[PDB]
Design an enzyme around this catalytic site. Structure first.
Site, short mmCIF file in Angstrom:
data_model
loop_
_atom_site.label_atom_id
_atom_site.label_comp_id
_atom_site.label_asym_id
_atom_site.label_seq_id
_atom_site.Cartn_x
_atom_site.Cartn_y
_atom_site.Cartn_z
N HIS A 1 -7.77 -7.35 18.42
CA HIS A 1 -7.56 -5.96 18.81
C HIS A 1 -8.00 -5.55 20.20
CE1 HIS A 1 -6.38 -4.57 14.74
NE2 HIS A 1 -7.25 -5.48 14.31
N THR B 1 -1.96 3.82 19.10
CA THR B 1 -1.18 4.26 17.96
C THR B 1 -1.05 5.77 18.08
OG1 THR B 1 -3.23 4.37 16.61
CG2 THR B 1 -1.90 2.35 16.45
N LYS C 1 -9.96 4.65 28.93
CA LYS C 1 -8.87 5.52 28.46
C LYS C 1 -8.67 6.64 29.49
CE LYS C 1 -9.61 4.56 23.45
NZ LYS C 1 -8.28 4.16 22.92
N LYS D 1 -8.35 11.14 21.80
CA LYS D 1 -8.67 9.75 21.48
C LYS D 1 -10.16 9.64 21.78
CE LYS D 1 -5.69 8.85 24.55
NZ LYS D 1 -4.77 7.80 24.05
N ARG D 2 -10.78 8.51 21.43
CA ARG D 2 -12.21 8.34 21.70
C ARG D 2 -12.47 8.38 23.23
NH1 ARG D 2 -15.63 6.33 17.59
NH2 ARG D 2 -17.21 6.56 19.25
N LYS E 1 2.19 8.41 17.38
CA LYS E 1 2.19 9.66 16.61
C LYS E 1 2.83 10.79 17.42
CE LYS E 1 -2.23 8.05 14.78
NZ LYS E 1 -3.68 8.16 14.82
C1 LIG Z 1 -4.75 7.61 15.68
C2 LIG Z 1 -6.09 7.95 15.94
C3 LIG Z 1 -6.86 7.28 16.89
C4 LIG Z 1 -6.27 6.20 17.91
O1 LIG Z 1 -5.68 6.96 19.06
P1 LIG Z 1 -5.46 6.29 20.55
O2 LIG Z 1 -4.90 7.43 21.34
O3 LIG Z 1 -4.57 5.20 20.18
O4 LIG Z 1 -6.77 5.79 21.03
C5 LIG Z 1 -8.17 7.63 17.05
N1 LIG Z 1 -8.78 8.63 16.32
C6 LIG Z 1 -8.05 9.32 15.38
C7 LIG Z 1 -8.79 10.43 14.61
C8 LIG Z 1 -6.69 9.01 15.17
O5 LIG Z 1 -5.89 9.75 14.30
C1 LIG Z 2 -11.57 -3.36 19.28
C2 LIG Z 2 -10.67 -2.15 19.05
O1 LIG Z 2 -11.13 -1.15 18.45
N1 LIG Z 2 -9.41 -2.22 19.53
C3 LIG Z 2 -8.46 -1.14 19.34
O2 LIG Z 2 -7.57 -1.52 18.26
C4 LIG Z 2 -6.43 -0.68 17.99
C5 LIG Z 2 -5.71 -1.23 16.75
O3 LIG Z 2 -5.01 -2.44 17.07
C6 LIG Z 2 -5.51 -0.63 19.26
O4 LIG Z 2 -4.38 0.23 19.06
C7 LIG Z 2 -6.34 -0.13 20.46
O5 LIG Z 2 -5.54 -0.17 21.66
C8 LIG Z 2 -7.67 -0.94 20.67
O6 LIG Z 2 -8.49 -0.31 21.64
#
Ligand SMILES: *Cc1c(COP(=O)(O)O)cnc(C)c1O
Ligand SMILES: CC(=O)N[C@@H]1O[C@H](CO)[C@@H](O)[C@H](O)[C@H]1O
Ligand SMILES: O=C(N[C@@H](Cc1ccccc1)C(=O)N1CC(C(=O)O)C1)c1cc2cc(Cl)ccc2[nH]1
Ligand SMILES: Cc1cc2nc3c(=O)[nH]c(=O)nc-3n(C[C@H](O)[C@H](O)[C@H](O)CO)c2cc1C
Ligand SMILES: *Cc1c(COP(=O)(O)O)cnc(C)c1O
Lengths: 791, 790
Positions: free
Chosen positions: B338, B637, B535, B529-530, B641
């Site tokens: 990942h 992901t 990011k 996102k986090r 969405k």
């Molecule tokens: C989908 C989701 C994530 C992953 O989002 P990215 O923009 O791909 O980092 C993280 N936190 C929550 C609560 C989510 O629904």
């Molecule tokens: C180590 C880890 O949390 N990796 C995370 O895994 C998700 C699920 O594959 C990816 O979408 C994302 O880009 C990545 O930052």
């Protein structure tokens, strides 16, 4: 009609609630399925009962205790609700054994012994009498430890009773409250403020208490500690606050001044009082009528903090003037004294209280000043009187005498048996009783006829009902009607057959549970209670050894066979109690495996003695050992259970034993040994155990065998500690009652050889047990202390 | 299960289960009553589904993960079971608001982000596809912390999600198991014995996973730690064993080598494998066919210990010879990679492993020897190759490279997006892929159309179903039918109205939750996102300030209004992430309260970003920020969405972003900045942020304002740490993409002024989102890795 719907509900729960079918369901699933099926029958009445108290607002009773020894709930609920026969039939039709399902349930062992069981018995009676009463305690994650015997020694195992879930408790999230600790007192111009405190939340869990056949369902509310709101460590550290309701202190009649225990006491007191105040303010009944609506019983001094907490609330929060608040406080509280033993007395060091509860320490001081000021005004020249009546003790380190706080903060103080209440009133607290003679009372303990007769001994209850009707269940005094059958040989043999079947059932228990083979026709000699030097299972052990030697002496002598059973838990730190257990398992090992005695005498140490196990052995008992030193057992309740279940009692004139003889006629009990006065005379004159060991040849032999390794060959001096205490530090005078005891015991066996006379005496005991119902105890509490009436 | 019986069941539960009546019931009681009413509908099918797997014994799939970011369960269950409309009506008839009851439920936040949400999305797809699959994790008493903002800073509050009870979990007491720790290895003549160990019990809790409209209900099994069996202290000390499942480590893409974490990893692995072995031996199925019956997917390296644990069981317990056990092991496991970020890599010090898991350390060594022996045999002269391919790293302190253990113990290794899987295969693990080219694969991530369309955006799902039918729910590729409406103005305005209503609903949320007044017609610019330097919400923050100054410059200039939203949690120890949050709340405070900008630009830091909150903001979004540095986001992901819900994307050619452009046409996304190759070239050549600050006048101003206290008057140097990293330690090159970013952003607003063209592009995105369904992702996993079928 009912059986059909009960089987339907069971299947519904098994499916929807346990997510199972008959091919994958476990025994535990079947138990839960039945528990839920029975639980549903409590809901309607529980909602209506609590709603009734709100509407008609009768004065409410709050039994505040750090212990509630409840045992199992399924059977009890089925019985009080009149559903047992229907359920028994439903489960049988489904192809299951209700007894097996019942054994699945864990005891709710939130108590140590008599004190916690009295609370449990009281909740059942208060509901059967229809009083608006509530039980308030702590929901310990772990109750009294499960006891194991390893290499003849007691071992403690955690009692994780909630692991699989408790269907009988109901979380009440909407009534969570914050409890405060530490911090510092701040005296401002708006009042005094208790600030910078750490908070621990208290989430209450309600358990229904069904009255016996009366549509009343009261509540037992138990509080569980929860934390409020390096990161990982900070989250783990939440365990520290939750540790407050983590485990029950496993000591019986023993004060252990640990800080955590202090926190538990304040925890349950603060949560409880806030909850009661809130309920008062919502009653539609500003606290003038508080005590006309609220009665709070302090079960021993454990919740003593409730007095300055109520004051703290009244004064610091509600802004009432001290004088008015103090008056309401006294009208609200009543205190029950459960012991005169020195090691059980709570004396908290002012230092510890100062850090944890600084505002409460100021309140206790104020109470003490107002208290001493009154005494100084009436008895000026008497300086030492002030020293003796103060809530503060300056002996070495300064500490608070919790018992004195309870007396001044209550309008009524009671003992638990005539002899005990007398000692409490005229000896121990003479200084207080003299000033307020009307304050001190007696309320002889009792046991509930439901759990301790109807449930545990169905055979006996049926026999009695067959002869005198069922009215005795709600009015045990009715048992005196059993007198009419005193000369009835068929009844006496029916009585003897019930006891015979209890023994057989329990024998099955002892043989699968323990090695030994039991003589089902032997006399069952039983002593089950917490291991204590004052309760003397040691004296009992001296007798077992005596009977042993005697058989070894004259093998073919005509000896009434006995199965001697001694069971009980020792507190973890009680070294002597633990030594006595080992001494007993050692003796048994020798007796049970000696070919010359064989089936003549068998000794059993019934491990993990607890409420559910008491329900088994008690009905199977012929002879009940109640042998504490006179003046030590404040009351006792085990003595009552055995009397109600057809056992004859061998004991001293102590606690409630005295009243049992009064009711049944001293001649119908095997009383012996020193009496209150005799122990006093001996104390003044000085006790020297060495002299009896000298005079008594049978005793000297017992002792020499113990001290020489006859019962511990691989460890010849293993019992050296027991020998020393008995000779140079026996505060309970074992050697002094040894002769009278063995003599008394000989007469018991003589009467046992006469089935017709033995059973005639048993009848006189059962027919005289009516006074010992907790229904009668509660009635007296209700009209002479709480001032409440049925609803 | 019609309306009348549903109201009946609800009242029944309220009474018998919650012990209440309508006058004393709380909102929480109503929620629970409904939850129980809905839960009952799962029982029949759950028992039948698990019973079916036993009878017909299809090959089973076990998704082993330390995280399952499940969110709330009520709505999801009502939808997959086709009960939502009936329940909605039942609750309404009873005089209650189902939305209010739904808000009572706590998120099951047993995950940090994408990784744990992917697991959650996969469970939903595996059940909808009818596969015999199970999810295996840890039932944390506390999930990801609840985030609070105090004085502009993030504060962590414990997430005590079980306090009031979880009606969706089922204790399975009969399957409790003992897990072993510490002790010592004893080599005897009857085999090797692991003795004198301390035991911690593992009690599993089952949660049903309903498939979408198919009678399938699978299981998610989470393990909780329990102690076995001075007295008081001894009982309190039981907290020590139970601490193993006490709390989720709140780090995203960050390895924290704490001993407790190691215990969690072994804990879940040991309990899981024993449970799988036991189920195998009772299947009525010789471990010869074990891998024909069992497939275990390693979600990242977190459960890497599962490899030597399976071997330990096969060898030490089952007595199989090493060679045979090793073969079955590889056929059983598959590993998913990942991330390529260095700080996320698990490298456990052999010392720590030696004390905790002495027998597993011996097993890993043996595996490494057999491994290196093979390599030495084929490439003799190549010494450094052995150093690079070893499971052991002797750099400073010796430690285990968990990723290498996963590669050698698995028969398949996959990345989560084309660009990422390529890097994993040919760059990072070139030494391994060269030897076994067929081992490495790609499996582009996906999201479930149920929770992320049907549930979260009922308005959009309805509009789509009205035009192309409902078949798209189970086959999202169906969305391409939406193309036929490309010139349909009425449809485009209907599409724009759905998004408009989402915005209004969410605006109501933002105004009651936050001070600020929102311009419902402004463009909703969102980045949730986090918080991570990689990011780059920081780059986003640079742009917000840019827009700010511009307005202050020319007040009356025609500016498309925006409501900028940035939300996410920072790991507790991540200082820079925390500084960036403070920087963002500071900026917002200035922007939102500046009279010259007013309703032109509003900035919001959406606190406590989590799954249930993602379901709200995502459907209300116009512009989705996916701006990580090229090569950093393995997949993503959240990007998917937003695409499925009608938002246009502004981002780099990274992770799955690349495939989104492929599917929708690069022209229909606002791509910008450096690409994988461009970041490389810059690295070789050397990056000096100071030069862009020099060249870019708008940037220099932004930076001078930050560093001078314009956004922290009372603490003029508060952001000194942010300034230093950007100038001398910006591994993610914020200044380097700043110009291309702002230029890209300008074009976005230009297109926003043209509703017809904006919405036409959105349509092209939605119609092209079919590839990103997790149903398609799972299908590829099933036929190319697990070898399983519905
Ligand atoms: C989908 C989701 C994530 C992953 O989002 P990215 O923009 O791909 O980092 C993280 N936190 C929550 C609560 C989510 O629904
Ligand atoms: C180590 C880890 O949390 N990796 C995370 O895994 C998700 C699920 O594959 C990816 O979408 C994302 O880009 C990545 O930052
Ligand atoms: O926990 C459920 N039932 C409960 C039933 C129960 C309730 C109270 C006491 C004993 C049993 C359960 O099994 N337990 C609560 C105990 C605990 O907290 O440890 C064990 C449950 C039923 C169900 C049905 C579906 Cl479809 C999904 C999840 C489910 N959980
Ligand atoms: C992708 C990524 C994730 C990080 N996660 C964390 C974290 O979870 N906790 C933490 O204390 N630091 C974290 N850091 C900061 C890291 O440990 C280190 O302090 C800095 O990168 C040095 O500038 C992270 C850094 C990066 C690049
Ligand atoms: C009744 C009871 C007691 C009290 O017994 P005494 O002999 O009166 O001290 C103790 N433990 C249990 C379990 C009881 O049922």
């Amino acid at each position: 009609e009912n059986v059909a719907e009960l089987k339907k509900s069971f299947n519904r729960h098994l499916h929807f609630t346990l997510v199972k079918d008959r091919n994958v369901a476990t025994t535990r699933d079947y138990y839960f399925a039945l528990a839920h099926t029975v639980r549903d029958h409590l809901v309607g009445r529980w909602i209506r009962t609590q709603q009734h108290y709100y509407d008609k607002c009768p004065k409410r009773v709050y039994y505040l205790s750090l212990e509630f020894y409840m045992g199992r709930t399924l059977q009890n609920t089925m019985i009080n609700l009149g559903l047992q026969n229907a359920c028994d039939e439903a489960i049988y039709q489904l192809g299951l054994d209700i007894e097996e399902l019942e054994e699945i349930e864990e005891d709710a062992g939130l108590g140590n012994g008599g004190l916690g069981r009295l609370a449990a018995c009281f909740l059942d009676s208060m509901a059967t009498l229809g009083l608006a009463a509530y039980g308030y305690g702590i929901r310990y994650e772990y109750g009294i430890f499960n006891q194991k015997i390893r290499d003849g020694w007691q071992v403690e195992e955690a009692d994780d009773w909630l692991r699989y879930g408790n269907p009988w408790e109901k979380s009440r999230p909407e009534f969570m409250l914050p409890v405060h600790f530490y911090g510092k007192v701040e005296h401002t111009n708006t009042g005094t403020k208790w600030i910078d405190t750490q908070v621990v939340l208290a989430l209450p869990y309600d358990t229904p208490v069904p009255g016996y056949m009366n549509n009343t369902v009261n509540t037992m509310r138990l509080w569980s500690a929860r934390a409020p709101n390096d990161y990982i460590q900070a989250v783990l550290d939440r365990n520290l606050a939750e540790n407050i309701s983590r485990v029950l202190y496993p000591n019986d009649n023993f004060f252990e001044g640990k800080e955590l225990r202090l926190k538990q006491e304040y925890f349950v007191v603060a949560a409880t009082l806030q909850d009661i105040i809130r309920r008062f303010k919502a009653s539609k009944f500003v606290f003038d009528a508080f005590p006309d609506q609220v009665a709070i019983q302090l079960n021993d001094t454990h919740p003593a903090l409730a007095i300055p907490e109520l004051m703290r609330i009244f004064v610091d929060i509600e802004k009432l003037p001290w004088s008015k608040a103090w008056e309401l406080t006294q009208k609200t509280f009543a205190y029950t004294n459960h012991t005169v033993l020195p090691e059980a007395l709570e004396r908290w060091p002012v230092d510890l209280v100062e850090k944890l509860l600084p505002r409460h320490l100021e309140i206790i001081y104020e109470i003490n000043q107002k208290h001493l000021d009154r005494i100084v005004a009436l008895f000026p020249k008497d300086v030492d009187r002030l020293r003796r009546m103060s809530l503060i003790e300056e002996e070495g380190s300064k500490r608070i005498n919790m018992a004195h706080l309870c007396i001044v903060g209550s309008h009524a103080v009671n003992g638990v048996a005539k002899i005990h209440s007398d000692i409490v009133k005229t000896k121990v607290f003479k200084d207080f009783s003299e000033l307020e003679p009307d304050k001190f009372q007696n309320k002889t303990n009792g046991i509930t006829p439901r759990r301790w007769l109807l449930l545990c001994n169905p055979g006996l209850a049926e026999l009695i009902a067959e002869k005198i009707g069922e009215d005795y269940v709600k009015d045990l005094s009715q048992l005196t009607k059993l007198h009419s059958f005193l000369g009835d040989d068929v009844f006496l043999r029916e009585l003897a057959k019930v006891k015979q079947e209890n023994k057989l059932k329990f024998s099955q228990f002892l043989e699968t549970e323990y090695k030994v083979k039991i003589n089902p026709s032997s006399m069952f000699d039983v002593q089950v209670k917490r291991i204590h030097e004052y309760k003397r299972q040691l004296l009992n052990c001296l007798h077992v050894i005596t009977m042993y030697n005697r058989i070894k002496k004259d093998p073919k002598k005509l000896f009434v066979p006995r199965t001697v059973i001694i069971g009980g838990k020792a507190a973890p730190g009680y070294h002597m109690a633990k030594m006595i257990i080992k001494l007993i398992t050692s003796v048994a090992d020798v007796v049970n495996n000696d070919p010359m005695v064989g089936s003549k005498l068998k000794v059993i140490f019934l491990e993990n003695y607890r409420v559910s196990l008491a329900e088994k052995v008690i009905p199977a008992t012929d002879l009940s050992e109640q042998i504490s030193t006179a003046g030590t057992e404040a009351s006792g309740t085990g003595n009552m259970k055995f009397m109600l279940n057809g056992a004859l009692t061998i004991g001293t004139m102590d606690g409630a034993n005295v009243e049992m003889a009064e009711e049944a006629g001293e001649e119908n009990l095997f009383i012996f040994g020193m009496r209150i006065d005799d122990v006093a005379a001996l104390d003044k004159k000085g006790y020297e155990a060495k002299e009896y060991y000298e005079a008594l040849p049978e005793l000297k032999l017992v002792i020499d065998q113990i001290d020489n390794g006859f019962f511990s060959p691989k460890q010849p001096d293993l019992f050296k500690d027991i020998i020393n205490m008995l000779f140079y530090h026996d505060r309970f005078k074992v050697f002094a009652d040894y002769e009278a005891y063995v003599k008394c015991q000989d007469k018991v066996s003589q009467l046992y050889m006469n089935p017709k006379a033995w059973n005639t005496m048993v009848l006189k005991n059962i027919a005289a047990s009516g006074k010992f119902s907790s229904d009668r105890t509660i009635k007296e509490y209700a009209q002479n202390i709480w001032n409440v009436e049925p609803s």
